[PDB]
């Protein structure tokens, strides 16, 4: 029998244990599942338009605070009066402002120029960031159609054009569709066809980070397999510069002097940031690039503070500690906190005490305290995400950035503990035994304090193999306009001339799987990085040299026509067989199908010239009984290659003997049947 | 142990079963936990307060 009570209850035990080993990893993946950040998008103060451009504004210590924008038609004269209490005046004489938020590409999306004119600059800079963060991740933005993909956008209600009551001259029905943050997450999920939760978050200076929290949750629950979190604060009006000045909180210089004694206000800046969030298991299983990992995010409120605007200390300590508890980590684990650093000599004191309480109380090494707003300015709903791009660039470059205007440490903060070192110099922050962790803090004017934990991506990417191949994979690119077609080859040429040594097959794979098929396509098969950057230098001007150019809107499925006679040369397929394994296998199969009925094996025939037969007193491929099998063999092998490279037929046309290939490749007859 | 051939592994199975119960109830108190509508307040049209 079964060795009574020793081979069953021990057999039932391994399943009450392993199911438990499986029902707990479910709780740990339902609550502490580390979500990956697949890709980065940012339009930040200054010249920053891409996540790699933000690093040489952040690593060499450049402040983005330059001045108020002039593109927007701002008054700029009633904004500044000597009387500080004059209604309609602003106190800050600058700030980091976007120089490209005024412009947009209407024809690129399904957007009319009039509708795009009615679109909020936040909502027009968010669609472009979504497209960028999808194209950065190797995920075709048109491939996510009717798929679960949440959109979580942090926003600030900003006055744009005329009163909705007064309507407009051209913007009558689209003015709501711009000046409502409602569609500021639904528009993105509509143009890209995303089906997951399109949620707009509004908690002011913490929105984006609160947003990513929600996105993180939507990943740790399984509602959406992917999320696009982040936040935008683009200012089309000086309105809150006028209004933040009335409470006397803006820094006259517009600079966020975070944790500095020379601070005279919290400053202001406009920006936008976007994170492509996916759970680590899904991110690595699908092959999506993992930059860093959001492990735990907490969102809390300041409670009954000293007013709605004043921050709270205990609530900040509670949210920073809750983020660590939900991430399963502790104070020491975080190697570099990048807290709000509002910029004022009131918020910074309170928040540094909270940092010293949640972190500095129990520290093994000095926590590297930083603030992105020092380099950029207070980006509000773009703050909470901008710090996340900072840290992710910090771990993808292995350096802890400076905090500008922080040489004079604040006298109102007790730094005598030494557990917190303000990042006034670039501290080397290399990969080591400890998983490199850090934490982003954002405390909004609404009182909602939020904190996220960013660990370095587990370094399991290492282990890739190397090889070489003769397959010249096409370098395919596409844009929505002819000028954009000439600009997607110039920027790629600039990238391959400024980032040299990137192997051509990697470039072809990234250009092919990761770029949407748009209705202006340029494609060339490179042989060298000098014969490709030359084509990319002719495609930038419009000259189609060594490439193929085409406008092909409303065209997705191809027909396979089969010509009959005409290539009497027949000295072609030798190279294809000698260089393509598929042509070296399908040809063998169809020949061995032809041999039982026609003894001629196409293999000796293949290795020859066009005048080979002429030497033996015979015209180029003239013997019908010997020629028809070889066209059939080469033809079916060519069709098999074309179907092996992803091109499948829609209809089939056979001129004279292409009917046999119609029998073979379309499944009507087998290789043996059609060969016979 | 002494009687038949199970006085130990039978307890390990019992606790393991109880834990699995207590960890599977955690899943259903984390994703499907009913959320009671403790109260409702409204200012809707028609003088409704």
């Amino acid at each position: 029998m079964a060795s009574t009570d020793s081979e069953k209850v021990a057999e039932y035990l391994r399943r009450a244990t392993l199911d438990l080993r499986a029902a707990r990893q479910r709780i740990r993946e339902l609550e502490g599942e580390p979500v990956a950040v697949v890709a980065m998008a940012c339009r930040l103060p200054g010249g920053v338009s891409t996540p790699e451009e933000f690093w040489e504004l952040l690593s060499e210590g450049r402040d983005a605070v330059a001045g108020l924008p002039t593109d927007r038609g701002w008054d700029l004269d009633s904004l500044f009066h000597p009387d500080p209490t004059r209604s309609g005046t602003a106190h800050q004489r600058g700030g980091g402002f976007l120089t490209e938020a005024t412009a947009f590409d209407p024809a690129f999306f399904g957007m009319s120029p009039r509708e795009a004119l009615a679109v909020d600059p936040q909502q027009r800079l968010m669609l472009e960031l979504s497209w960028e963060v999808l194209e950065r991740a190797g995920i075709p933005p048109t491939s996510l159609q009717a798929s679960p993909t949440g959109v979580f956008v942090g926003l600030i209600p900003q006055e744009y054009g005329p009163r909705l009551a007064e309507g407009g001259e051209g913007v009558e029905g689209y003015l709501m569709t711009g000046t409502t943050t409602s569609v500021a997450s639904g528009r993105i999920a509509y143009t890209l066809g995303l089906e997951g939760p399109a949620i707009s978050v509004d908690t002011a200076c913490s929105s984006s980070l609160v947003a990513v929290h929600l996105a993180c949750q939507s990943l740790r629950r399984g509602e959406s397999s992917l999320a696009m979190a982040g936040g935008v604060t683009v200012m089309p009006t000086p309105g809150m510069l006028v209004d933040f000045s009335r409470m006397n909180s803006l820094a006259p210089d517009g600079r966020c002097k975070a944790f500095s004694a020379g601070a005279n206000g919290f400053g202001m800046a406009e920006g936008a940031g976007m994170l492509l969030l996916e759970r680590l298991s899904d991110a690595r299983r699908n092959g999506h690039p993992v930059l860093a990992v959001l492990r735990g995010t907490a969102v809390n409120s300041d409670g009954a503070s000293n007013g709605l605007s004043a921050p709270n200390g205990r609530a900040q300590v509670r949210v920073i500690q809750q983020a660590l508890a939900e991430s399963g980590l502790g104070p020491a684990d975080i190697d570099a906190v990048e807290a709000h650093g509002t910029g004022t000599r009131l918020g910074d004191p309170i928040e540094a005490r909270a940092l010293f309480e949640a972190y500095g109380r129990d520290r093994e090494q000095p926590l590297h305290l930083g603030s992105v707003k020092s380099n950029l300015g207070h980006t509000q709903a773009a703050a909470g995400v901008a710090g996340v791009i900072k840290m992710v660039l910090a771990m993808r470059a292995g350096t802890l950035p400076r905090t500008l205007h922080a040489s004079e440490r604040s006298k109102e903060i007790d730094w005598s503990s030494g557990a917190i070192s303000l990042l006034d110099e670039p501290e080397p922050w290399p990969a080591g035994a400890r998983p490199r962790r850090a934490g982003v803090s954002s405390f909004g004017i609404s009182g909602t304090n939020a904190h996220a934990i960013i660990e370095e991506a587990p370094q399991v990417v290492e282990g890739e193999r190397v090889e070489a191949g003769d397959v010249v994979a096409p370098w395919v690119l596409s844009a929505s306009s002819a000028e954009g077609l000439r600009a997607q080859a110039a920027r790629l040429a600039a990238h391959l001339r400024e980032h040299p040594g990137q192997d051509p097959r990697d470039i072809a794979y990234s250009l092919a799987t990761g770029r949407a098929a748009l209705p202006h396509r340029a494609a060339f098969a490179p042989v060298d990085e000098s014969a490709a950057l030359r084509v990319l230098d002719g495609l930038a001007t419009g000259n189609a040299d060594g490439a193929a150019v085409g406008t092909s809107r409303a065209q997705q499925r191809a027909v396979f026509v089969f010509p009959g006679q005409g290539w009497q040369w027949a000295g072609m397929a030798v190279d294809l067989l000698d260089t393509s394994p598929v042509f070296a296998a399908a040809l063998r199969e169809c020949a061995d199908a032809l041999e039982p009925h026609l003894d001629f094996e196409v293999i000796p025939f293949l290795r020859a010239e066009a005048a080979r037969r002429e030497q033996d007193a015979a015209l180029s491929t003239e013997r019908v009984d010997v020629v028809q099998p070889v066209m059939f063999a080469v033809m079916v092998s060519l069709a098999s290659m074309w179907r092996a490279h992803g091109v499948e037929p829609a209809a089939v046309i056979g001129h004279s003997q292409g009917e046999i290939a119609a029998a073979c490749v379309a499944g009507a007859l087998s290789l043996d049947d059609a060969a016979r | 142990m002494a009687s038949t051939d199970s006085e130990k592994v039978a307890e390990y199975l019992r606790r393991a079963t109880l834990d699995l119960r207590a960890a599977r109830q955690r899943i259903r108190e984390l994703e499907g936990e009913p959320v009671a509508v403790v109260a409702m307040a409204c200012r809707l049209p028609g003088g409704v307060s």
Partner: antibody
Amino acid sequence: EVQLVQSGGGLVQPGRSLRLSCTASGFTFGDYAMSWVRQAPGKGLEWVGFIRSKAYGGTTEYAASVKGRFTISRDDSKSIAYLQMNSLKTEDTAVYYCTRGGTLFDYWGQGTLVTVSS
Amino acid sequence: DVVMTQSPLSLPVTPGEPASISCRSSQSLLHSNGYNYLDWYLQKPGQSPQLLIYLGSNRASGVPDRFSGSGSGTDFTLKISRVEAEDVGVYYCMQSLQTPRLTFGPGTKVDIKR
């Protein structure tokens, strides 16, 4: 994950020998007791046999009908379980299943359709 | 002797309905451990069987919650809270008191009800 990939199909006549190989991937092979269960066409399961775990003696227990002929063996080093089918009669024309437990048949593998016809 | 078991061989189910499949055993499957030693199994149409429930009531990992098990030492009942196309097939009632296991029994033939 866990898989119980199977092999050993083919053609046999009444009075021949056959091999059913089960490869387990995902967990330690030595502490599970292998079992072979059969699917007669038209009905559900009937259990063929079970070998004890390596540390539980590794002794075998088959059904009276297939006692001896249907030998059950296993091995950890290459992690493989053998059902050697001997003198397959025409009542052995069935879908055999590699089960992951002497009393707890968990994964059931895939199922090999063994045919015994003249 | 042997614990020979019976079940509702031809129990019908319909989409959107909770179903109650049962098993009856001659002897008592409740061991001195206090744990019922019954197993519920599901065979899909033309696929490998799967282990739904062990020890009378508890799940196997990966088996949806839509199956629940209960019952006394003799009578055992599995309720499907919500039947679907994946909850169709053959349900096997397995005793773990005596193993030799000659056959799996008649099995409950489950079909979508019209």
